[PDB]
């Protein structure tokens, strides 16, 4: 159920090579809160920005939830070549997302020989393990 303490969810970004604005997945409910994948191009050389967002729409300022997560870009040819990074973060209203602005090089993820992109689609996955929240279910 939505009260579960962990879940894995995926979001496939289409027309990936043409991405310009941040894109957001539908919510996955864990600890009864909505978690989402956020992806955007970033520049510093171009990189994939990949973030996990928690409970961002709520106007509450009382809530918090600590979670650990694995953020993964799927390699569709060989899951052993999928690329992942781990985070731990206390999510709350003023810091409702966390991840990596330079998760991977854009030129690598979009390289058709590497196995992450197919039909201009790239799939992102999050495994999130969340603690019981505070300041929500009183």
């Amino acid at each position: 159920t939505s009260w579960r303490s962990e879940a894995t969810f995926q979001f496939t970004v289409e027309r990936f090579s043409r991405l310009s604005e941040s894109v957001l997945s539908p919510p996955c409910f864990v600890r009864n809160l909505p978690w989402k994948i956020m992806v955007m191009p970033r520049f510093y050389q171009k990189s994939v920005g990949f973030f996990l967002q928690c409970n961002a729409e709520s106007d509450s300022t009382s809530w918090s939830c600590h979670a650990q997560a694995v953020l993964k870009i799927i390699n569709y040819r060989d899951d052993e070549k999928s690329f992942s990074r781990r985070i731990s973060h206390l999510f709350f209203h003023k810091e409702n997302d966390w991840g990596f602005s330079n998760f991977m090089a854009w030129s690598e993820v979009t390289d058709p020989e590497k196995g992450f992109i197919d039909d201009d689609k790239v799939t992102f996955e999050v495994f999130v393990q969340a603690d019981a929240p505070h300041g929500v279910a009183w």
């Binding site: 955007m40 510093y44 973030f51 967002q53 990074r85 997302d97 966390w98 602005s101 998760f103």
Partner: peptide, 8 residues
């Protein structure tokens, strides 16, 4: 660096 942190 992988740029760990918030999106904004």
């Amino acid at each position: 660096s992988p740029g760990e942190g918030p999106s904004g």
